[PDB]
Amino acid sequence: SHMHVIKRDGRQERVMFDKITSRIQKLCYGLNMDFVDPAQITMKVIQGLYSGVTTVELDTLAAETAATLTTKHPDYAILAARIAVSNLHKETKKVFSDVMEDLYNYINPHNGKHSPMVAKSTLDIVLANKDRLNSAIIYDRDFSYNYFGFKTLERSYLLKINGKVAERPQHMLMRVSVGIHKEDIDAAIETYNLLSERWFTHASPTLFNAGTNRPQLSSCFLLSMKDDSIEGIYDTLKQCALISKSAGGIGVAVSCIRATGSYIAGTNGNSNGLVPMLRVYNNTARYVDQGGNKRPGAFAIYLEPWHLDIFEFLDLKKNTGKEEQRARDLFFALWIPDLFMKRVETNQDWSLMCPNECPGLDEVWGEEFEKLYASYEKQGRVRKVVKAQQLWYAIIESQTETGTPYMLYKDSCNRKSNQQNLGTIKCSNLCTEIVEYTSKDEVAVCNLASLALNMYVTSEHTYDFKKLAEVTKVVVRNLNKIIDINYYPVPEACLSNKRHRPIGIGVQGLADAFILMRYPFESAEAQLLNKQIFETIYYGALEASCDLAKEQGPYETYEGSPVSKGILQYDMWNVTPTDLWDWKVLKEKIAKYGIRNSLLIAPMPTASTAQILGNNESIEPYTSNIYTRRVLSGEFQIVNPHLLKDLTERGLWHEEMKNQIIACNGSIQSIPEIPDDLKQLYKTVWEISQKTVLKMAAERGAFIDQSQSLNIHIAEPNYGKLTSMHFYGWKQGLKTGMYYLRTRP
Amino acid sequence: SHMHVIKRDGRQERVMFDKITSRIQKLCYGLNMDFVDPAQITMKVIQGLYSGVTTVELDTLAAETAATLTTKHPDYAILAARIAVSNLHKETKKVFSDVMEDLYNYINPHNGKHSPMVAKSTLDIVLANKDRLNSAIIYDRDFSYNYFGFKTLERSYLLKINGKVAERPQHMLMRVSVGIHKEDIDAAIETYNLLSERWFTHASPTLFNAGTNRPQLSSCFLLSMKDDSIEGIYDTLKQCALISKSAGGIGVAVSCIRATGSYIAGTNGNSNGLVPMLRVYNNTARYVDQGGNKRPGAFAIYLEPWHLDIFEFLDLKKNTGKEEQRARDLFFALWIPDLFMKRVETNQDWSLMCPNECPGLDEVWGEEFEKLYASYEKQGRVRKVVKAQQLWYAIIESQTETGTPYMLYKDSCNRKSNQQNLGTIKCSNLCTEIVEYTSKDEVAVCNLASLALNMYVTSEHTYDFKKLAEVTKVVVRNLNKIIDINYYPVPEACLSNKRHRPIGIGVQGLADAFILMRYPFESAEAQLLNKQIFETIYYGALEASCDLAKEQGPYETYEGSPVSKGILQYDMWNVTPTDLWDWKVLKEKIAKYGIRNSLLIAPMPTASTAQILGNNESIEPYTSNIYTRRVLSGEFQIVNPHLLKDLTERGLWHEEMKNQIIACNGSIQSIPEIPDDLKQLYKTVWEISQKTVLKMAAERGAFIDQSQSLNIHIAEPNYGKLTSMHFYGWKQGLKTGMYYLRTRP
Ligand SMILES: Nc1ncnc2c1ncn2[C@H]1C[C@H](O)[C@@H](COP(=O)(O)OP(=O)(O)OP(=O)(O)O)O1
Ligand SMILES: Nc1ncnc2c1ncn2[C@H]1C[C@H](O)[C@@H](COP(=O)(O)OP(=O)(O)OP(=O)(O)O)O1
Ligand SMILES: Nc1ncnc2c1ncn2[C@H]1C[C@H](O)[C@@H](COP(=O)(O)OP(=O)(O)OP(=O)(O)O)O1
Ligand SMILES: Nc1ncnc2c1ncn2[C@H]1C[C@H](O)[C@@H](COP(=O)(O)OP(=O)(O)OP(=O)(O)O)O1
Ligand SMILES: Nc1ccn([C@@H]2O[C@H](COP(=O)(O)OP(=O)(O)O)[C@@H](O)[C@H]2O)c(=O)n1
Ligand SMILES: Nc1ccn([C@@H]2O[C@H](COP(=O)(O)OP(=O)(O)O)[C@@H](O)[C@H]2O)c(=O)n1
Ligand SMILES: [Mg+2]
Ligand SMILES: [Mg+2]
Ligand SMILES: [Mg+2]
Ligand SMILES: [Mg+2]
């Protein structure tokens, strides 16, 4: 008949338009009514309406229209967040316990199987404790997310039932706290309130599988080859298949595979090298997706540069060429020793050999690698001799073209790690921050936890240090409770992760801490500031693991580590820390009790986590002050809201200032309406000299017991800033030369 | 200095040209000197000579030039064979024993490893018995190969040392007879003389690895999936990797993998189907090569047509489209039941379902499959309904475009096999002749042995039957000795191949037996003839396995088979055999002693084996009377030498008759110089109606206890001859509808 809409109860009515403005103005309380205008939003919604429309599409399109209108006044972000979050909170259930009973009592709607979303012990903990725990949840905190962080949180992370999302966000975060803190409830309420107050957040597989039926909370996996045979290659392929099933990240050390042309004693033939093998890993990276297709399964391939197939390895992730000689859905990385640095330095030659001819090489680092490599370089057992600057030119061609390979430094990582007593660290994970020991028997597993920073900044614009160590103590107790609950997908993972027991802590949003502390990025108080911050994080981490080892005893391989010898991570950098803390009593209690976890700190990139909480990616500056937004039918420009927060107060903001920053791509310094302080507080990273950031990485990574991601931003391809940049990173002592060479077009 | 050639001792001399004609005329004894001309060969050799040439290149180019001059007179084939074979027999050693000591005493020339070419027990058998066995070898038989068969035999099959071939052909065939007949010598000399007199030959992995260090003599491997999980898929991928390492042929039953969109209870997602999985098997088929790169590892993928992904499965081996939706280095095949035949027959509908929804389907054949498929077709549990002639049109589009898929008939194979007591035969091998039971526990392995035919034709033009059964007895004793010596690459292979113990016998060159018996291909004595031949082969095979079971007892699962119930293979076809033999006493001795091997006869294609011995491919007619030859710088036309043998006697051959058959592509029937008998004795297969060949396949395959290859030759794409051809093959009862749709351009 007429234009009827399908009202959410399931019924239909006539189109009465004042229900829209009746609802929006109800959801506009507490905003600037001088620019909050329900009529424009209603008008663009009615531009899209038709007959027979479910009303949840009208609320979705209402929040979408408010998100597109956010450019006119910044309160429409708060409005659009209230529209989407109110749309969800009207939909699903109020009580957490009946949601959990609905998830456990799930039935596959065409197979009849009692196929739960949560394990029965999780439901046991909930139903035994629902009275305190339903009282602990606070739904006032769900209106605190950004809109785009809420849509990113909704599209993939909330547990769905037949396509309809059936979890509020506090149901997910309380589900995580039950999923980790099993027996105890006080830790679940301190962990819940410290969690939902957005102080720290766990990693994404923890948000996937906390308390579910297959609890695989880990996110870091480091695998090396079992053998240089078909059985080793395909058994390693099997382990990468299972681990990439249970939503992990896999970095593979592929150093020990014989090269093209070496003799095969079994079938009297010659090998074809690494290129079809890594092509098999290419199709495996396409087939298995992490979890329920939530993100594609990605593999890192690490190769040391002395291997003979290095040129076809570097020409492998490209765009042109034959298709059968490209494997472009992987991530390639070079695990470079100091000798290739020295031979590129003085234009000498370089010996590409085959690890069947020269066996047992990648397990040897430093001066011993110099002696063994020189002794094989003497005997003439090598196969090819290439001038080192030619291969360096090939590396800069590959990084210039695609950004791959990554570059890590072998002797720097093997020298400055707490797992020296085990052997030689072969590889690292996909995002190049977990530097741990791998073997044929031990497959390295590490857990993650990302602390935010800008929630700690007080109103005095003086940073809070004493809170940060305290939350770090709660985090270390969380991860150390994670390691003993996790279900490892392969049997080699449990022995490594329970013998050595590592954790991982990484912060996100350093640029917001600098803006809210009101310092320039290349100032003196910034370089003092991050140094003091990671002294606080590192100190509180060591105090927390000390207080755990006082209660459960240290890990199984402690005596032999340099921490048992008193050398902490900063002395391996030979940098005495500041007088901000008391390190003597810390080293006394460590010398009397040990520590519980081997490796502690690890700055991860946190793309998706910082996408949720609105912070910037972990430590880098803003890419531009204008950042785009992916909206259906609108992909548009939103300025940095801290910059806009200062501009509305300083008066220089007007109705075309956005258009004034369109034609400069974030560069606010070219405009004549300038207080000449925003040019220091809001430096575009393209307008930031990279070597100051590298010095800041030398200080901060000098207070980190693992590596850290390092997105290199360079506007134009030039070999001097690249070559001097990598050599400068090697001279400062960094464990990671690069993670991406990013060139803006 | 001057033009010096490097004489084979390693020295150098001046170019003296009468050494060439001094040698060729020495190697021309016994030929037609009216057309044997050393001066033309010498002239074209000296066209290629230069300074500093090793003289073995001069003999190689001499045999090559004689091979190109063979068109002028057929004795230059005998000449070129004598040149190449004399070139090899001047080179390597005369004594077999010192060759074997050289192979076992091999050392890798840059690793020092005593890496043998033969096992130490083989050398023990040789050195304990070298006195009789060096006397048994006859080097007069090496001048009996064709030239192109000798070059094909030399480039890949003779065991090389550092690129230089160090085996005479009788060294290889005697190496095979030592490699099979281990303790006994009389069987090695009867097997050697019956072998090197070119009566029968083993399969190609037997020629690869007889008596070597990794004895993997088998050539047929049938694998099904362990599980519909990641562990089953990648464990099956591991087994296909090891088996394709040790030079086997792998056919995989991929029926039991869930389709696109089905729910995954582990990670709450949906599967992507079969297309990326078979893309992973595509790169695995590219990476692992069979043996020492001797032929590329190929996989067969069998799918039953009721699976939901059947359309993307059929559009998968093509040329155009996106690259990520194609897997073209595989071989695809449909395992069709009778219901798709009946629904295509009467234009009805067809139910594409998912084997997670409808479990346990491919293990059910015939009327029970009709009942179970109708019961799932009733409940509405199916997912798609497609008109059957549409999918049949897609099949004819795929076979028309590339020739894949193959077509096998499920109920026909499950009904007419001796392994009915085990369960349901899921799949078959790559070349579609081995129809055996596969399981999660039993991986099917079958050995092969190809008998030639035209060596049996006596001078009376009456075929020898009593010899053929006798050589068949020697063959069955050979293969039954092969099964107990073989080293299976996976542990599931040994249990199947020792419980059920199958063998495989296939003949090659039926067209030569018809020409040497002087009958037309579509005559009456041809259809009588092959029927009598396979009654002889089948009878002698059953008598041989009976006489083995009289001595060792039948296999472990005999009682339950229809042979124990007295029904042989011909009664499953309901065709009483001829009165050529005595079947009553055979069935009495089988009824009193059983048989040793379950399945016996299997016509394989034998591309490479018939390429060696000069026979035609197994049972098909000649593709054309003119067949080309691959020669370096000359790829030219040589007529069928039996046709030429009749033409030089009947006088109609002249110096331009080749040019008269150029413009007709083998069709000798269009020329006016015709005795009108060669038009019957030498029918081009494009000039042969296919349904007579299908009737001949109904008779011959009615006397075969497994399937047989069937190369379908049709000159133009037409749907009536295709559709009526497959339906005609289903009406005759054949186990294999097609193996290739070949269209000449
Ligand atoms: N009769 C209507 N015609 C057109 N749009 C409507 C109508 N009623 C509501 N809408 C719009 C207003 C909102 O933008 C959106 C959702 O309305 P909403 O009131 O929340 O559904 P609902 O009526 O079931 O919720 P509730 O019953 O709790 O009020 O649909
Ligand atoms: N058929 C093959 N095709 C391509 N590569 C192969 C093949 N077989 C082996 N390889 C590669 C895989 C490994 O990188 C390497 C050695 O495999 P492996 O099984 O250890 O050889 P092997 O043990 O039979 O001889 P070796 O003793 O020299 O290692 O050669
Ligand atoms: N001096 C020569 N100059 C050019 N070609 C030669 C010369 N001698 C021989 N040839 C050709 C003739 C043959 O086609 C080919 C091989 O000759 P061949 O006699 O078999 O080498 P060889 O002399 O070492 O063998 P052998 O010592 O047993 O006689 O080279
Ligand atoms: N991450 C993935 N990406 C793509 N396909 C997958 C993935 N995980 C599983 N599959 C496919 C492979 C199999 O065809 C199918 C079932 O695998 P399987 O391990 O049995 O699932 P599961 O056991 O965890 O859940 P279920 O009990 O329903 O099988 O799903
Ligand atoms: N595309 C990606 C990126 C990271 N990761 C894994 O997640 C870890 C940290 O990356 P991250 O914190 O940015 O991942 P998110 O938590 O943001 O999803 C890495 O060590 C990888 O193991 C992944 O599996 N897939
Ligand atoms: N390209 C091929 C052809 C056949 N084969 C295997 O060899 C068996 C018989 O084929 P064939 O007799 O033509 O092989 P050859 O002996 O001629 O080399 C088949 O069952 C396959 O298992 C193979 O592995 N690769
Ligand atoms: Mg309403
Ligand atoms: Mg080996
Ligand atoms: Mg000579
Ligand atoms: Mg499963």
PDB file of N, CA and C in Angstrom, chain B residues 139-176:
ATOM      1  N   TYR B 139      75.814 -57.775 -25.910  1.00  0.00           N
ATOM      2  CA  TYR B 139      75.862 -56.415 -26.437  1.00  0.00           C
ATOM      3  C   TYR B 139      75.472 -56.319 -27.898  1.00  0.00           C
ATOM      4  N   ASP B 140      75.072 -57.426 -28.517  1.00  0.00           N
ATOM      5  CA  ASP B 140      74.600 -57.394 -29.893  1.00  0.00           C
ATOM      6  C   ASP B 140      73.200 -56.812 -30.010  1.00  0.00           C
ATOM      7  N   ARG B 141      72.496 -56.655 -28.893  1.00  0.00           N
ATOM      8  CA  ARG B 141      71.109 -56.226 -28.883  1.00  0.00           C
ATOM      9  C   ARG B 141      70.951 -54.719 -28.768  1.00  0.00           C
ATOM     10  N   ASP B 142      72.029 -53.990 -28.494  1.00  0.00           N
ATOM     11  CA  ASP B 142      71.933 -52.546 -28.363  1.00  0.00           C
ATOM     12  C   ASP B 142      71.808 -51.830 -29.694  1.00  0.00           C
ATOM     13  N   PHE B 143      72.170 -52.475 -30.797  1.00  0.00           N
ATOM     14  CA  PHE B 143      71.991 -51.895 -32.116  1.00  0.00           C
ATOM     15  C   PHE B 143      70.605 -52.160 -32.680  1.00  0.00           C
ATOM     16  N   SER B 144      69.638 -52.491 -31.827  1.00  0.00           N
ATOM     17  CA  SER B 144      68.291 -52.816 -32.257  1.00  0.00           C
ATOM     18  C   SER B 144      67.278 -51.742 -31.898  1.00  0.00           C
ATOM     19  N   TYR B 145      67.681 -50.711 -31.170  1.00  0.00           N
ATOM     20  CA  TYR B 145      66.756 -49.636 -30.867  1.00  0.00           C
ATOM     21  C   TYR B 145      66.632 -48.692 -32.053  1.00  0.00           C
ATOM     22  N   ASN B 146      65.541 -47.937 -32.073  1.00  0.00           N
ATOM     23  CA  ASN B 146      65.468 -46.804 -32.977  1.00  0.00           C
ATOM     24  C   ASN B 146      66.367 -45.687 -32.475  1.00  0.00           C
ATOM     25  N   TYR B 147      66.631 -44.728 -33.360  1.00  0.00           N
ATOM     26  CA  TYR B 147      67.480 -43.603 -32.992  1.00  0.00           C
ATOM     27  C   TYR B 147      66.806 -42.713 -31.964  1.00  0.00           C
ATOM     28  N   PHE B 148      65.557 -42.332 -32.217  1.00  0.00           N
ATOM     29  CA  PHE B 148      64.878 -41.414 -31.314  1.00  0.00           C
ATOM     30  C   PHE B 148      64.523 -42.089 -30.004  1.00  0.00           C
ATOM     31  N   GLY B 149      64.254 -43.392 -30.045  1.00  0.00           N
ATOM     32  CA  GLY B 149      64.108 -44.142 -28.815  1.00  0.00           C
ATOM     33  C   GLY B 149      65.400 -44.241 -28.040  1.00  0.00           C
ATOM     34  N   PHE B 150      66.531 -44.267 -28.738  1.00  0.00           N
ATOM     35  CA  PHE B 150      67.798 -44.294 -28.031  1.00  0.00           C
ATOM     36  C   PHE B 150      68.146 -42.940 -27.442  1.00  0.00           C
ATOM     37  N   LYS B 151      67.791 -41.850 -28.116  1.00  0.00           N
ATOM     38  CA  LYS B 151      68.088 -40.543 -27.548  1.00  0.00           C
ATOM     39  C   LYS B 151      67.168 -40.245 -26.375  1.00  0.00           C
ATOM     40  N   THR B 152      65.909 -40.681 -26.464  1.00  0.00           N
ATOM     41  CA  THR B 152      64.998 -40.547 -25.332  1.00  0.00           C
ATOM     42  C   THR B 152      65.443 -41.429 -24.172  1.00  0.00           C
ATOM     43  N   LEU B 153      65.960 -42.619 -24.478  1.00  0.00           N
ATOM     44  CA  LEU B 153      66.492 -43.493 -23.440  1.00  0.00           C
ATOM     45  C   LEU B 153      67.756 -42.919 -22.821  1.00  0.00           C
ATOM     46  N   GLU B 154      68.516 -42.152 -23.585  1.00  0.00           N
ATOM     47  CA  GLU B 154      69.793 -41.662 -23.102  1.00  0.00           C
ATOM     48  C   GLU B 154      69.663 -40.379 -22.308  1.00  0.00           C
ATOM     49  N   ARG B 155      68.735 -39.496 -22.683  1.00  0.00           N
ATOM     50  CA  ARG B 155      68.716 -38.173 -22.072  1.00  0.00           C
ATOM     51  C   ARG B 155      68.229 -38.198 -20.633  1.00  0.00           C
ATOM     52  N   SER B 156      67.503 -39.236 -20.225  1.00  0.00           N
ATOM     53  CA  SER B 156      66.863 -39.193 -18.920  1.00  0.00           C
ATOM     54  C   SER B 156      66.994 -40.481 -18.120  1.00  0.00           C
ATOM     55  N   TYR B 157      67.230 -41.614 -18.772  1.00  0.00           N
ATOM     56  CA  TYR B 157      67.101 -42.869 -18.043  1.00  0.00           C
ATOM     57  C   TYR B 157      68.423 -43.479 -17.622  1.00  0.00           C
ATOM     58  N   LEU B 158      69.486 -43.299 -18.393  1.00  0.00           N
ATOM     59  CA  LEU B 158      70.775 -43.860 -18.024  1.00  0.00           C
ATOM     60  C   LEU B 158      71.387 -43.057 -16.888  1.00  0.00           C
ATOM     61  N   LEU B 159      71.967 -43.762 -15.920  1.00  0.00           N
ATOM     62  CA  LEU B 159      72.473 -43.107 -14.722  1.00  0.00           C
ATOM     63  C   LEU B 159      73.765 -42.369 -15.038  1.00  0.00           C
ATOM     64  N   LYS B 160      73.757 -41.062 -14.824  1.00  0.00           N
ATOM     65  CA  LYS B 160      74.846 -40.194 -15.236  1.00  0.00           C
ATOM     66  C   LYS B 160      75.822 -39.987 -14.090  1.00  0.00           C
ATOM     67  N   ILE B 161      77.067 -39.682 -14.435  1.00  0.00           N
ATOM     68  CA  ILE B 161      78.078 -39.304 -13.458  1.00  0.00           C
ATOM     69  C   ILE B 161      78.631 -37.954 -13.881  1.00  0.00           C
ATOM     70  N   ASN B 162      78.269 -36.909 -13.125  1.00  0.00           N
ATOM     71  CA  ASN B 162      78.716 -35.527 -13.323  1.00  0.00           C
ATOM     72  C   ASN B 162      78.387 -35.004 -14.718  1.00  0.00           C
ATOM     73  N   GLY B 163      77.256 -35.433 -15.270  1.00  0.00           N
ATOM     74  CA  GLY B 163      76.836 -35.010 -16.583  1.00  0.00           C
ATOM     75  C   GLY B 163      77.255 -35.918 -17.714  1.00  0.00           C
ATOM     76  N   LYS B 164      78.172 -36.846 -17.478  1.00  0.00           N
ATOM     77  CA  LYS B 164      78.608 -37.782 -18.502  1.00  0.00           C
ATOM     78  C   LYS B 164      77.938 -39.123 -18.247  1.00  0.00           C
ATOM     79  N   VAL B 165      77.258 -39.646 -19.266  1.00  0.00           N
ATOM     80  CA  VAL B 165      76.525 -40.895 -19.127  1.00  0.00           C
ATOM     81  C   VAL B 165      77.509 -42.045 -19.005  1.00  0.00           C
ATOM     82  N   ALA B 166      77.356 -42.849 -17.959  1.00  0.00           N
ATOM     83  CA  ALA B 166      78.298 -43.925 -17.691  1.00  0.00           C
ATOM     84  C   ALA B 166      77.613 -45.282 -17.613  1.00  0.00           C
ATOM     85  N   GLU B 167      76.566 -45.484 -18.403  1.00  0.00           N
ATOM     86  CA  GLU B 167      75.910 -46.781 -18.481  1.00  0.00           C
ATOM     87  C   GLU B 167      75.551 -47.112 -19.915  1.00  0.00           C
ATOM     88  N   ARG B 168      75.980 -48.283 -20.364  1.00  0.00           N
ATOM     89  CA  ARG B 168      75.446 -48.859 -21.573  1.00  0.00           C
ATOM     90  C   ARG B 168      74.007 -49.307 -21.318  1.00  0.00           C
ATOM     91  N   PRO B 169      73.196 -49.466 -22.369  1.00  0.00           N
ATOM     92  CA  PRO B 169      71.809 -49.907 -22.140  1.00  0.00           C
ATOM     93  C   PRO B 169      71.680 -51.295 -21.537  1.00  0.00           C
ATOM     94  N   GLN B 170      72.520 -52.250 -21.944  1.00  0.00           N
ATOM     95  CA  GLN B 170      72.479 -53.555 -21.301  1.00  0.00           C
ATOM     96  C   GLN B 170      72.965 -53.499 -19.861  1.00  0.00           C
ATOM     97  N   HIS B 171      73.774 -52.501 -19.514  1.00  0.00           N
ATOM     98  CA  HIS B 171      74.096 -52.285 -18.115  1.00  0.00           C
ATOM     99  C   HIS B 171      72.874 -51.832 -17.340  1.00  0.00           C
ATOM    100  N   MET B 172      71.983 -51.074 -17.977  1.00  0.00           N
ATOM    101  CA  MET B 172      70.783 -50.651 -17.272  1.00  0.00           C
ATOM    102  C   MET B 172      69.797 -51.798 -17.137  1.00  0.00           C
ATOM    103  N   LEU B 173      69.614 -52.589 -18.193  1.00  0.00           N
ATOM    104  CA  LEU B 173      68.620 -53.656 -18.126  1.00  0.00           C
ATOM    105  C   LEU B 173      69.092 -54.802 -17.240  1.00  0.00           C
ATOM    106  N   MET B 174      70.387 -55.103 -17.271  1.00  0.00           N
ATOM    107  CA  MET B 174      70.913 -56.067 -16.316  1.00  0.00           C
ATOM    108  C   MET B 174      70.907 -55.506 -14.898  1.00  0.00           C
ATOM    109  N   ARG B 175      71.097 -54.190 -14.745  1.00  0.00           N
ATOM    110  CA  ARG B 175      70.945 -53.563 -13.435  1.00  0.00           C
ATOM    111  C   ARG B 175      69.519 -53.683 -12.911  1.00  0.00           C
ATOM    112  N   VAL B 176      68.531 -53.642 -13.803  1.00  0.00           N
ATOM    113  CA  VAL B 176      67.149 -53.840 -13.387  1.00  0.00           C
ATOM    114  C   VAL B 176      66.923 -55.280 -12.952  1.00  0.00           C
TER     115      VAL B 176
END
